[PDB]
Design a protein around this ligand. Structure first.
Ligand SMILES: Cc1cn([C@H]2C[C@H](OP(=O)(O)O)[C@@H](COP(=O)(O)O)O2)c(=O)[nH]c1=O
Ligand SMILES: [Ca+2]
Length: 129
C-alpha cells in the first residue's frame, strides 16, 4: 500500500472526517474500526481523540487498501495518518474503537489492529473498562 496526500476540511466524529483528496472534498470512513456514535458512551471521547489528532497534524495522508475505495454511501475507505501515526490504530490502542467491518480484500492492517485491541483490553481502557 501507499500513502497519498490529503488536507483536513473538518473533523466529524471518531471514525469519519471530511478531507480534501486529489483536490475534492470527501467524507472518509476509517477502515477496520468502529467508534461509538457521539450519542453513545465513549462517543464524545472518540470524537475528541480523532479531532485532536487530525487538527494538530502538520501532514495528513490517506492509504487505500487493495479492494473497495468507497462505500455505498460514497465515503472513502482508508487508513488515515497524522504526522505518520495511523489514526485507525491509535483509536483501537486507546480503547476508543473496536476492530470491526473486516471485509476480505480490504484487511491489510487487520493483525496490527487486533494486536492494539488486545493491549487496550489488557489495560481495561475506556470501552474495555
Ligand atoms: C468501515 C466500513 C463500513 N461500511 C458500511 C457498513 C455499514 O453499513 P450499514 O450502514 O447498512 O450498517 C456502515 C457502517 O458505518 P458506520 O459505523 O459509520 O455507521 O458502513 C462498509 O461497507 N465498508 C467499510 O469498510
Ligand atoms: Ca461508528
Amino acid at each position: 500500500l501507499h500513502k497519498e496526500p490529503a488536507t483536513l476540511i473538518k473533523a466529524i466524529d471518531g471514525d469519519t472526517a471530511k478531507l480534501m483528496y486529489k483536490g475534492q472534498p470527501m467524507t472518509f470512513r476509517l477502515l477496520l474500526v468502529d467508534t461509538p456514535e457521539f450519542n453513545e458512551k465513549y462517543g464524545p471521547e472518540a470524537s475528541a481523540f480523532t479531532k485532536k489528532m487530525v487538527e494538530n497534524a502538520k501532514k495528513i495522508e490517506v492509504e487505500f487498501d487493495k479492494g473497495q475505495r468507497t462505500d455505498k454511501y460514497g465515503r472513502g475507505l482508508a487508513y488515515a495518518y497524522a504526522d505518520g501515526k495511523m489514526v485507525n490504530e491509535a483509536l483501537v490502542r486507546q480503547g476508543l474503537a473496536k476492530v470491526a467491518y473486516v471485509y476480505k480484500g480490504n484487511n491489510t492492517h487487520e493483525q496490527l489492529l487486533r494486536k492494539a485491541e488486545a493491549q487496550a483490553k489488557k489495560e481495561k481502557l475506556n470501552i474495555w473498562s
